[PDB]
């Protein structure tokens, strides 16, 4: 054989060289660094009003406004400071799995099992919120979506694909393929020039938004990936899985850097988020709790106990003042 | 301590709270039914017979039903079945016409879920005009050696029904409602109405401790 032999020998030799030139793990270089202690955080605000499981939640760029979507087919925009409900958008499909808040603050994006990314305009002259656009073309369910700008958004789907759209035209500018399983989460880089996405094929990968080419792929995993997020500098990313483990990869070494697992943890991770410093990795588990992990020591730095059902979504403000957590118990909680 | 504008914002928030409560009430009187089954199982037949994700809203005897069909999802990765908790029932469709083993494994899968241990299942064998003529070609042993009963309609159909019932691994919490009567007769929705009524009554009873 030549094509099969070529593929096998390539993969083997690249991976062997990567392993050989690997110097040390994340923990090996930070052993001298002192820990953070116990991250004891209190529920400062509790957002009541959602009457079903909360699936997605995204902070606004002002670090004061929130948007959350519930299984009840409702997208609530909250004023976290006072617990004032700013907006209540009735979604067209009640099966919504992702939320995004436009960096400018004029738009919000949502969607789910309807295979459509709906974009709603907040700053209208009529005093209400309307459906600005609907992006269609994905075949599998809508896993995640993130605004690049006021007119350019990036999406992941369960078709093993991602899509870069142009909101004005409504057509998908680029289609990113290469996954073999359902793509469950995407994170946008701070400079909005790349992104990373994990799929049900138990693999993650870095995709360039401009060239539409598959820049890199990362493996070393047992189960599917349900959550992914960038380090605040866009030089790494953490993934959460049904394996009951969270893994931190670097996009330059091309190798997994650190593992975030504990023996008593038996269920998967639903959501992943980073501290403003990237010093605390917050992970929502199926154990009805949210764990805070020392991103450099891999230890559990705390637990955001206080949710009576699965913690579905996490989020950290842009200023790092508070953490929003949404669970299946129909409550969002802000912790500080 | 509120400013003149914060008071109006709080009034708006309270109005939004009222709207959310009054729409959640409206959403809590509606019977949510998941629709499952293999291909060519009558799913398309049932959705038309019934009075990405495809939602069918229909009213029967004052009960408003939202039937959710997720057959369009081409990935069998069950990454969204947990989204269908709280649904009153799962309508699973099978055809008497080894695709039967495929239906059996699907039924075992749906029953085994930790997310559906409390939700009854409504299994249908709806059509009855093509379920008899093809039983004479050969007994129920082309891929099922174990059957040793009369190779007639009622005997073999009842045996298959009982064998699908047998996959219920814990009959203590949930129940199975089976259907046979021809699809031509307008009884398919009526049976669904009775099954959901029974499910809701038992849920109410199991809530006040009268279970």
């Amino acid at each position, epitope marked *: 054989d030549q094509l099969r032999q070529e593929a096998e020998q390539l993969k083997n030799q690249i991976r062997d060289a990567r392993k050989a030139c690997a110097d040390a793990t994340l923990s090996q270089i930070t052993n001298n660094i002192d820990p953070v202690g116990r991250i004891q955080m209190r529920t400062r605000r509790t957002l009541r009003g959602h009457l079903a499981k909360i699936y997605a939640m995204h902070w606004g760029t002002d670090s*004061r*406004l929130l948007v959350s979507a519930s299984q009840d087919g409702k997208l609530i925009i909250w*004023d976290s400071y006072t617990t*004032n409900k*700013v*907006h209540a958008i009735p979604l067209r499909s009640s099966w919504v799995m992702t939320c995004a808040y436009a960096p400018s603050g004029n738009y919000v994006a949502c969607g789910g099992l309807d295979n459509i990314c709906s974009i709603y305009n907040l700053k209208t*002259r*009529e*005093g*209400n919120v309307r459906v600005s656009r609907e992006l269609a073309g994905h075949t599998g369910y809508l896993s995640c979506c993130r605004f690049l700008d006021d007119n350019q958004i990036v999406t992941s789907s369960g078709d093993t694909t991602c899509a870069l759209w142009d909101i004005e035209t409504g057509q998908q500018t680029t289609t990113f393929t290469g996954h073999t399983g359902d793509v469950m989460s995407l994170s946008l880089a701070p400079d909005t020039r790349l992104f990373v996405s994990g799929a049900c094929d138990a693999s993650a990968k870095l995709w360039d938004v401009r060239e539409g080419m598959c820049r890199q792929t990362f493996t070393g995993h047992e189960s599917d990936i349900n959550a992914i997020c960038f380090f605040p500098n866009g030089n790494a990313f953490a993934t959460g899985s049904d394996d009951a483990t969270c893994r931190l990869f670097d996009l330059r070494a091309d190798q997994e850097l650190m593992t975030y697992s504990h023996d008593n943890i038996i269920c998967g991770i639903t959501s992943v988020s980073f501290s403003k410093s990237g010093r605390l990795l917050l992970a929502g588990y199926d154990d009805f709790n949210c764990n805070v992990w020392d991103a450099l020591k891999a230890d559990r730095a705390g637990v955001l106990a206080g949710h009576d059902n699965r913690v579905s979504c996490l989020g950290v403000t842009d200023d790092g003042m508070a953490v929003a957590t949404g669970s299946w118990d129909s409550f969002l909680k802000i912790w500080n | *301590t509120l*400013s*003149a*504008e*914060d*008071k*109006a*914002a709080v*009034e*708006r928030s309270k*109005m939004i709270d009222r709207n959310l409560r009054e729409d959640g009430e409206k959403a809590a009187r509606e019977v949510k039914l998941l629709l499952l089954g293999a291909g060519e199982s009558g799913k398309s037949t049932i959705v038309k017979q019934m009075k990405g994700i495809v939602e069918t809203h229909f009213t029967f005897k004052d009960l408003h039903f939202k039937m959710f069909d997720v057959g369009g999802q081409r990935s069998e990765r069950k990454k969204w079945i947990h989204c269908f908790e709280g649904v009153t029932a799962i309508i699973f469709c099978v055809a008497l016409s080894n695709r039967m083993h495929e239906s059996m494994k699907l039924f075992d899968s749906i029953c085994n879920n930790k997310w559906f241990t409390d939700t009854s299942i409504i299994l249908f064998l709806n059509k009855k005009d093509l379920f008899e003529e093809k039983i004479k070609k050969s007994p129920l042993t082309i891929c099922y050696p174990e059957y040793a009963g009369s190779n007639t309609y009622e005997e073999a159909a009842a045996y298959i029904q009982c064998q699908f019932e047998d996959l219920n691994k814990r009959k203590d919490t949930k129940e199975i409602y089976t259907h046979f009567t021809c699809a031509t007769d307008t009884k398919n929705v009526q049976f669904v109405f009775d099954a959901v009524t029974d499910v809701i009554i038992k849920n109410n009873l199991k809530d006040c401790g009268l279970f």
Partner: single-chain antibody
Amino acid sequence: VQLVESGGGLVQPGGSRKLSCSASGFAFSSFGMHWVRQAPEKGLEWVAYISSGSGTIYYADTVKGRFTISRDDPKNTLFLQMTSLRSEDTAMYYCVRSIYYYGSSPFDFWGQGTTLTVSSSDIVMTQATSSVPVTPGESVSISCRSSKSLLHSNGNTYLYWFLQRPGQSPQLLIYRMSNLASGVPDRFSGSGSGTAFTLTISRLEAEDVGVYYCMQHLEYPLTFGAGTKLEL
């Protein structure tokens, strides 16, 4: 957006009338409404307010207990029923929309007004001047002073800035502090601190002539200023 008033005319003292306001082009039910008035070449004066949902109705001390403000959300209509009309109730009355939520502009749109003629504690804000000559292209700086500190604990300094052009209804320019409204040229800017407040205009144009008004929203009743005129 369109707010058209009606019901004005000449009325003898001791009579009663009902000013009406028809709305078209926005989510009226989610908007509170203000009734304002301007006496002949004397200035703007707040009349009343009704919030979204009719849950809060406020009246001006000058006409508090005399007058009533009524909402009709299904018909998108506002009413001001005036019972006893003295010789001081002669003015052109404006219908204004106002929505309150984090970041909103609560006086974006004013109506065209309707005229009424009649036969023959509160924060005080003063406008330092009433007429200022200027030529196009020369920057201008209007200013006004207030009694208390409009800066609330929220960090919001609830001082507004409207401009009334010759022969047309007032137009919002700033809704808290330099926060330019929608559709206003970027040249207009606002600023101030506590009591002294200023409005700056760079590259003045021919459409910028008129009367500048500074109002406060920290506490009711709402109090306007005298009105600083710009000459050319």
